[PDB]
Every structure is written in C-alpha cells, then in structure tokens.
Structure 1
Amino acid sequence: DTMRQRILVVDDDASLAEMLTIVLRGEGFDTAVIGDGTQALTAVRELRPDLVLLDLMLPGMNGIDVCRVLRADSGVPIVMLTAKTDTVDVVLGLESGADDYIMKPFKPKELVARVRARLRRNDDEPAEMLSIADVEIDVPAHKVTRNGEQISLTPLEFDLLVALARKPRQVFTRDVLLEQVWGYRADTRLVNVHVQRLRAKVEKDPENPTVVLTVRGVGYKAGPP
C-alpha cells in the first residue's frame, strides 16, 4: 500500500547494471543507475533511494569514498559489490558505514535476499520501549536517547542495539548476530566493525563500554541496565 521501494545502483559495468535493473524491477522495486562515484550524492538527494548498491571499484570516486560522502548525509543502507580483482580493502568501506557486502559474480537470488534483509522494517510498528544501561529506546519511533537527548544512529546500528536490548541476559556470538541482524542463512568482521561504530555513538567512553559489552571468547551482550 502501495508504492515501490527504490534502489540506486552505482556501478560502471553497464551490463550488470542492466541485469540488476531487470531483476530488481521484476521483484517489485523501482530502480535507477549511475556509473560514476561523483554522481552519487546528487542522485541520492534527488531520488531518496531506500537502499544503494555500490561498486567498490568505480570511476570518478571509488566506493569507499562514496560511502564516506553518503554517510555524512544519511543512514541509507549501502550494500558494497566487491570482486576478487578489487585493489582496495572492502573493510575500509564497512568501517565508513557500508552495512553489508556481496562478492561478484553473485546469483541474483542471493543479491535480492541481501536487499530484502536491509528493508525488513514495517511502517506503524507496535509500541515498544526498551532500556539498556542508561540508554532508552522507543522502537517504533526510532529514537534512542540518554537523559532525554537523542543519539543519532544508522538503521543498522539501531537494529544491532535493539537486538541486544531486547534480551539483556543473552550473550550473542558473532555468527548468531549475523544471522539475526544481518539476515544470513559468513564474514563475522561485519559484526565487529558495526559494534565498534555503534559503541562510538552510544558509549560515554567507547574504550570502556557500558552499553554494549564484550564477553571475551564468546560474543557481545547488553550492558547492565
């Protein structure tokens, strides 16, 4: 009810971009394509896509750079497309805020699964208030606060914190978090990277966490509320 979600494809491989256009539209998405990193900020602001698929190695400005630019602008989900030939490290992209990455060549069904995993949130979510350590979360309002002041988080950082806060006594391994938050049915550094990005925003002192705790040897868990 009733409008199509919109994906921006940022890739200079015009054949793959054409195929992605065809596959995504048959799945019910609207799509647009650009072929140069220098066009991305204007494209995102003009189209407001629900998600961006982003080639790591691009003309004009590479994918790590595009990331940093778009993340200064919004939390819009970004999935990096990587290839074994890439000459730059996809981890710098994740550290800059890319939510996820998929290796070329990929099957279009796995690509579509990655897209849908980032777009699971309903409109009009049921009422739900959580707390974790000294942080409050109003889930359907997408608002995290400490002493009433809001803490800004990307949707991925928000989903990570909510999963810990919902089960404050649970220790989550990294594979368990990948599957639960990222939605896989492989790379657990994704979890490490985004934990650090989340801590950098919600911790009074990120070197000494109270909100998101490391359980050495096992995983992570909610701080003592």
Structure 2
Amino acid sequence: MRQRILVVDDDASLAEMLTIVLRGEGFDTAVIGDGTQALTAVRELRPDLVLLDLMLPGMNGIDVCRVLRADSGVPIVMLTAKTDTVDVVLGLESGADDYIMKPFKPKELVARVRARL
C-alpha cells in the first residue's frame, strides 16, 4: 500500500493543490478542514503523516497537535504563514516534528514530507 498523508487545512484551494501534487508524487491523500475532526480522521485513516495548518477553525493547530500527539507518534508537520499570530515553535513543543512556511514551493514541501516520514 502507498503512504498516506492527511492534510488538515481550511484553505480548500491549497488543499486541492496538495492533493494533486502529493498524489502525483505517489501518495494517497485525505483532507479535513476542521481541527475537531482530526482525531477521528487519524484513527480511522491511519495516516503516515499529518500536514497541519497552525490556524484552523474549530480547534487550532497547537491544540490539534496535542491531541494527536497523545494518541500516537504519527509525524506532524505544521503549515504556517508569516501572518499567523500563534507561534509555530509552540507547535513543535506540543509535539510536531517540523514546520513549513506558507506559501511554499510544492517541490520543497514534498521533500520535507519525505524527510519526516
């Protein structure tokens, strides 16, 4: 079976782009736009890696990271924008393995994803 990446971002357009690009790189993808549905998604989907937007509707990325981190050791990479008010390092401390600045070169994102797997 191919590796699975769960994308948790409220940016539907960006998520579609990640879907296409990641799928093009040989991965399978699933998308959720809300933090509250992340735990269930992870438990059900069983993703190899989670790409997690730091600022989300419902639960925020740091909060989501904690819950996920509590459930398992699945790798989490934060997606963060320079605009974001919350500090991404806080997310790393909550257990995320890495982070990426938005917007990004898809090529760079895939590489980092491959590196944290």
Interval of TM-score (by shorter of Structure 1 and Structure 2) = over 0.9
Provide the C-alpha distance between the structure 1 equivalents of 2:110 and 2:49, rounded to a whole number of angstroms: 12
Q: Which residue does the alignment assign to 2:46?
A: 48
Tell me the SS of whatever aligns to 1:53.
Answer: strand
Uncovered stretches (5+) of structure 1, i.e. residues with no partner = 120-225
Uncovered stretches (5+) of structure 2, i.e. residues with no partner = none
Provide the C-alpha distance between the structure 1 equivalents of 2:115 and 2:59, rounded to a whole number of angstroms: 27
Percentage of matched positions with identical amino acids: 100
TM-score (norm 2): 0.99
Provide the C-alpha distance between the structure 1 equivalents of 2:114 and 2:89, rounded to a whole number of angstroms: 22
- Of structures 1 and 2, the one scoring higher in RCO (CA 8 A, sep 6+) is 2
Provide the C-alpha distance between the structure 2 equivalents of 1:20 and 1:109, rounded to a whole number of angstroms: 11
Provide the C-alpha distance between the structure 2 equivalents of 1:63 and 1:40, rounded to a whole number of angstroms: 10
Provide the C-alpha distance between the structure 2 equivalents of 1:115 and 1:93, rounded to a whole number of angstroms: 17
Tell me the SS of whatever aligns to 2:71.
Answer: coil
Provide the C-alpha distance between the structure 1 equivalents of 2:116 and 2:83, rounded to a whole number of angstroms: 26
Which of the two has higher C-alpha Rg?
1
- Root-mean-square deviation over aligned CA pairs: 0.4
Shift of 1:17: 0.1
| Residues 47-66 of structure 1: CA deviation (Å, up to 9, x unaligned) | 00000000000000000000
Shift of 1:69: 0.3
Provide the C-alpha distance between the structure 2 equivalents of 1:115 and 1:91, rounded to a whole number of angstroms: 18
Provide the C-alpha distance between the structure 2 equivalents of 1:107 and 1:95, rounded to a whole number of angstroms: 25
Shift of 1:15: 0.3
| Residues 198-221 of structure 1: CA deviation (Å, up to 9, x unaligned) | xxxxxxxxxxxxxxxxxxxxxxxx
Normalized per residue, the structure richer in helix is 2
Provide the C-alpha distance between the structure 2 equivalents of 1:88 and 1:51, rounded to a whole number of angstroms: 22
| Residues 120-161 of structure 1: CA deviation (Å, up to 9, x unaligned) | xxxxxxxxxxxxxxxxxxxxxxxxxxxxxxxxxxxxxxxxxx
Runs of 4 or more, structure 1, over 4 Å off, are: none
Provide the C-alpha distance between the structure 2 equivalents of 1:5 and 1:84, rounded to a whole number of angstroms: 29
| Residues 93-146 of structure 1: CA deviation (Å, up to 9, x unaligned) | 000100000000100000000110012xxxxxxxxxxxxxxxxxxxxxxxxxxx
Provide the C-alpha distance between the structure 1 equivalents of 2:113 and 2:90, rounded to a whole number of angstroms: 21
| Residues 171-208 of structure 1: CA deviation (Å, up to 9, x unaligned) | xxxxxxxxxxxxxxxxxxxxxxxxxxxxxxxxxxxxxx
Between the two proteins, the alignment pairs up a number of residues equal to: 117
Q: Which residue does the alignment assign to 1:24?
A: 22
TM-score (norm 1): 0.52
